[PDB]
């Protein structure tokens, strides 16, 4: 009698009966491959979440589902025997749990109404489902497109008031992790691009902190100053290699230097190069760029 369920019933009433039940349609293995692959990001987040929830909830009778936007079961875990009692009703990997298929149910009703929804007992349109409680919360993507559901099912006598919020808190973690995970992915792709740029210079380029620690060095300056790219990062410059008079002064004087001839000592070998040095004035102090031009 919730205003939700009421509507759901008006949708179901026209086109199905309450006492009939047929095995709900299942996407056949091969094309289930493409359905599952399409969600690797969501599923690898959602599974971790569900293995943990299960881990601190076992023993108990219930199952945990991750569905996609179409109400298709992507993966199931939880109590072995409960997954099997539901499996005995046709709830399997790749089963579609849409409203048109199995009637009114949180598995489909949450996505429809756009928020966490719990259905139990004879709220469900089909009678087969009457000794079950279902909790499900939908999750959205970067754009705001419904992109899956987390659901929890258990024998109706056993639902607890924490069951709904449990699915919502998990939907929150997976949804919220996708969005910020993909914002990382982007701002990381941006780094690789901006690096590949500096990796592609003509000049050798090295930069360091106001404190004196190497920040950036490219393959090219790595060869020229015979430093190891990785092992160099964050390490103090003067401990990395001994600098020529002119540079000492120009670091100190915060002065610029244009195409100056300069001699560096790396780990006992001396390297002659022609350099350009530029102060990068900031609030926290001055950084520097040194460019090693290839004669």
């Amino acid at each position: 009698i919730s205003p939700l369920i009421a509507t759901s019933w008006e949708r179901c009433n026209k086109l199905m009966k309450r006492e009939t039940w047929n095995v709900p349609h299942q996407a056949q293995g091969v094309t289930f491959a493409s359905i599952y692959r399409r969600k690797k990001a969501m599923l690898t987040l959602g599974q971790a979440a569900l293995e943990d929830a299960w881990e601190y909830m076992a023993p108990r009778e219930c199952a945990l589902f991750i569905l996609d936007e179409t109400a298709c079961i992507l993966s199931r875990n939880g109590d072995p025997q409960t997954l099997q009692q539901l499996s005995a009703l046709g709830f399997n990997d790749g089963t579609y749990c849409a409203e048109g298929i199995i009637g009114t149910c949180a598995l489909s009703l949450a996505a429809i109404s756009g928020q966490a929804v719990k259905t139990m007992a004879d709220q469900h349109f089909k009678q087969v489902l009457w000794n079950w409680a279902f909790c499900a919360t939908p999750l959205f993507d970067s754009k705001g497109r419904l992109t899956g559901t987390i659901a929890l099912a258990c024998p109706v006598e056993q639902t607890t008031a924490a069951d709904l919020p449990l699915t919502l808190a998990i939907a929150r973690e997976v949804g919220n992790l996708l969005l910020t995970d993909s914002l990382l992915a982007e701002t990381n792709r941006h780094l690789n691009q901006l690096n590949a740029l500096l990796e592609s210079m003509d000049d050798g380029v090295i930069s360091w902190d106001e404190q004196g620690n190497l920040q950036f060095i490219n393959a090219q300056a790595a060869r020229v100053l015979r430093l190891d790219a990785t092992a160099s990062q964050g390490r103090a410059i003067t401990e990395l290699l001994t600098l020529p008079a002119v540079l000492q002064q120009a670091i100190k004087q915060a002065h610029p230097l244009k195409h100056v001839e300069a001699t560096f000592e790396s780990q006992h070998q001396f390297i002659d190069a022609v350099i350009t040095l530029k102060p990068i004035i900031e609030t926290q102090g001055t950084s520097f760029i040194l460019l090693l031009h290839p004669v």
Binding site: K14, L15, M16, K17, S34, I35, T70, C72, G100, R145
Partner: protein, 356 residues
């Protein structure tokens, strides 16, 4: 009950087997169920694909053939097909030149076809979508966000089918069907409800000489109920609603296959006015005597004439039905010359068949 069926769960299978036997130029696939041209993939042209619930026949199954649909996906009676069927069907009909999905504006369909679109894309099938929302009667119905997609889907399937056939690229097909969907206007009435065989009870019930005005094809409530007065009162007020509700602004969503994303697109409909040329479809919703449709048609031409609309072509008959519902829809589609040339172009399907 007056259902010509056997077991209630077999009705769809029986009827699909019947269709395939009757028309050997079509192929019935199983696990899952879909229907395509016997000769697909037809390498070279844009594959044209549609579907939705069964119960509307000949739509969409009767419209598979040269110069129209490449294949269809029927689902359950009055129920969207699930994306796996849409997926595999579009993979069966891929022409190498793109696949155009035609989607009637319903919650289930939209969601299901949209996902099937994304599935195909990930599999690297060039694909885009056209959405039909002609039903001028109600904004947000029982199964619809926005306007409902009804009988104008059949004209659009034919016109776009012809462009596909001719040789036009995926883009111009989609742009065409998309223009068309802003020029078609439709409204239906029912004097008797359809019964879906699985529910066993009529999907609504009207009192004596009362009609559901602006009904939809899954037996969704109309604008209201109102006393049925005469065929003339009915065609008049159906026709006045096509003008009054003609002008309409909304957002439709298409798949931009280049960007790999759903591009939203605000667009407006112009209400038919003096000087427009139209195609008119007087459509049996299921159980109206053909005789009567002509009576409707007769009144429709008087109203078009007096409003200054010039009917150029027509279809009269059972083209987009709602099981056994007693009523009819009127579709008017605004046309120019290129459109009529596409109309007259050949078509060879179990339900529309003309031209060399």
């Amino acid at each position: 009950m007056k259902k010509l069926i056997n077991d209630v769960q077999d009705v769809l299978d029986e009827q699909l087997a019947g269709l395939a036997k009757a028309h050997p130029s079509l192929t019935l696939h199983q696990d899952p169920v879909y229907v395509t041209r016997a000769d697909a993939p037809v390498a070279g042209k844009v594959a044209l694909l549609s579907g939705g619930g069964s119960g509307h026949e000949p739509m969409h199954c009767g419209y598979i053939g040269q110069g129209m649909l490449s294949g269809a996906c029927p689902g359950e009676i009055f129920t969207s097909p699930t994306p796996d069927k849409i997926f595999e069907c579009a993979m069966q009909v891929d022409g190498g030149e793109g696949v155009l999905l035609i989607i009637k504006n319903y919650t289930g369909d939209i969601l299901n076809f949209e996902t099937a679109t994304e599935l195909l894309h990930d599999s690297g099938v060039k694909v885009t979508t056209v959405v039909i929302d002609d039903d001028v009667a109600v904004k947000d119905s029982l199964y619809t966000a926005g306007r409902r997609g009804v009988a104008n889907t059949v004209l659009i399937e034919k016109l776009v089918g012809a462009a596909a056939e001719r040789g036009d690229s995926l883009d111009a097909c989609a742009e065409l069907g998309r223009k068309l969907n802003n020029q078609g206007h439709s409204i239906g009435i029912a004097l008797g409800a359809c019964t879906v065989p699985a529910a066993g009870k009529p999907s609504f019930t009207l009192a004596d000489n009362e009609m559901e005005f602006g009904v939809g094809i899954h037996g969704e409530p109309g604008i209201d109920r109102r006393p049925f007065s005469s065929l003339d009162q009915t065609v008049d007020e159906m026709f006045d609603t096509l003008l009054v509700n003609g002008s309409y602004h909304r957002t439709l969503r298409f798949w931009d296959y280049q960007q790999g994303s759903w591009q939203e697109e605000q667009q407006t409909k112009q209400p038919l006015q003096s000087g427009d040329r139209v195609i008119a479809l007087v459509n049996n919703l299921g159980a109206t005597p053909l005789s009567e449709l002509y009576g409707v048609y007769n009144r429709l031409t008087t109203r078009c004439q007096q409003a200054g609309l010039t009917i150029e072509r027509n279809l009269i008959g059972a083209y987009c039905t709602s099981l056994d519902m007693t009523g009819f829809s009127i579709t008017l589609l605004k046309v120019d010359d290129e459109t009529l040339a596409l109309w007259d172009a050949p078509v060879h399907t179990p339900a529309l068949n003309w031209g060399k």
